[PDB]
Design a protein around this ligand. Structure first.
Ligand code: AMP
Ligand code: CL
Length: 372
């Protein structure tokens, strides 16, 4: 008779929102369980419908999976809420966050691998889903399932125990997995270590409540998950100091960083809230280099439409075009998404400056080379 996991109100609200023609139309997708052969419903909204005070959503979870019961639907799997970059929304501006949020501020690196949700049902089933798919898509759900079973065998923990512990806490584990079949990202990642990383744990409720990272680590050691680096800053001023110093330095712990995911609790009602701080440079310059490289490999055309980093991009083309012309093997891997970072650093070595050092004296050097 336990109605503590009944979510039929939210199910009714989602079904009603499904019929809405154009604004806030609930998107429904029925998947089949890979273990129990039963069915689970995945709900999802349009991205442009998120994060707007004029568009109230029944739930704000990126990834939501509910059971297929007409008298007691239960949230099988829940992901994080949709959270946005700084200044992207009026409630992620650099001034509103200090006023309306408190500590403790937790900073993790931006994920690079595929995201998977691991939960458990009453029947001991270990339900592994991915971006709105459990049938199964990217099929990273099944890849991560194989990784998880392999790592559970390595510690002798049966998947039944993990499913039962998830069910008893009514939690979904959000995990990032990075296979070697994955492509390279523009900025290098020092936590490649192919396997399953545990990004967090959420309670399967309509509202967003996530475990603190220490509990996540304790759960991960209990189930052979690869731990994730993070740092804690108690106040907003310390966090702004760390973020601005890291941006002025471009190195977190001797590594190139694309972005940070920062978790905190809102000052009013003490609810969890995430926001992203993305370092625009040197990500933009490197991605422009990669795009012009792919354009040359596919067309042998070195004309580009960019307005920023034009001189350094032309120098990069001067250095790299002979390499691409005379190394057909490098072109194939580059098009497949490999060797981007190595070729980038080869150019950075030829030019004699670091990427940040290039960015610092760039208008100086561009105007100087134009003047000559
Ligand atoms: N560590 C992370 N950094 C950035 N986005 C994340 C992370 N973990 C999960 N996401 C979610 O992934 C989605 C965007 O991924 P993508 O657009 O494929 O880069 C959004 O729903 C994010 O909230
Ligand atoms: Cl509800």
């Amino acid at each position: 008779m336990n109605l503590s996991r009944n979510v039929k109100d939210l199910v009714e609200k989602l079904e009603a929102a499904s019929q809405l023609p154009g604004r806030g139309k609930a998107i429904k997708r029925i998947c089949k369980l890979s273990n129990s052969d039963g069915q689970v419903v995945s709900w999802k909204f349009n991205e442009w419908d998120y994060g707007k005070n004029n568009i109230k959503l029944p739930c704000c979870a990126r990834g939501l999976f509910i059971t297929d019961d007409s008298k007691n639907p239960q949230i099988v799997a829940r992901g994080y809420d949709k959270f946005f970059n700084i200044d992207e929304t009026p409630f992620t501006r650099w001034d509103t966050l200090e006023s309306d949020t408190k500590g403790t501020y937790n900073v993790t690196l931006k994920a690079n691998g595929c995201i998977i949700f691991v939960s458990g049902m009453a029947d001991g089933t270990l339900v592994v889903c991915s971006k709105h798919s459990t049938g199964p898509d990217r099929n990273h759900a099944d890849a991560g399932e194989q990784f998880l079973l392999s790592q559970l065998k390595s510690i002798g923990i049966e998947p039944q125990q993990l499913a039962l512990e998830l069910y008893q806490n009514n939690v979904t584990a959000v995990a990032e997995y990075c296979d070697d079949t994955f492509e390279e990202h523009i900025l290098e990642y020092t936590n490649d270590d192919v396997g399953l990383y545990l990004h967090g744990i959420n309670y399967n409720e309509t509202t967003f409540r996530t475990w603190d990272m220490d509990s996540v680590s304790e759960f991960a050691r209990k189930y052979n998950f690869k731990q994730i680096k993070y740092e804690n800053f108690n106040d907003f001023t310390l966090l702004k100091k760390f973020l601005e110093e890291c941006s002025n330095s471009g190195t977190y712990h001797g590594q190139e960083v694309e972005g940070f995911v920062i978790r905190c609790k809102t000052r009013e009602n003490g609810n969890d809230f995430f926001f992203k701080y993305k370092f625009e440079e040197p990500y933009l310059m490197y991605r422009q280099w990669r795009e012009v490289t792919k354009d040359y490999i596919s067309t042998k055309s070195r004309v580009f439409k960019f307005k920023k980093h034009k001189f350094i991009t032309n120098k990069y083309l001067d250095f790299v075009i002979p390499i691409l012309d005379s190394s057909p093997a490098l072109c194939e891997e580059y098009m497949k998404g490999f060797g981007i970072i190595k070729l980038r650093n080869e150019f950075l070595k030829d030019f004699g400056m670091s990427g940040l050092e290039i960015l610092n004296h760039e208008k100086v050097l561009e105007l100087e080379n134009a003047n000559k």
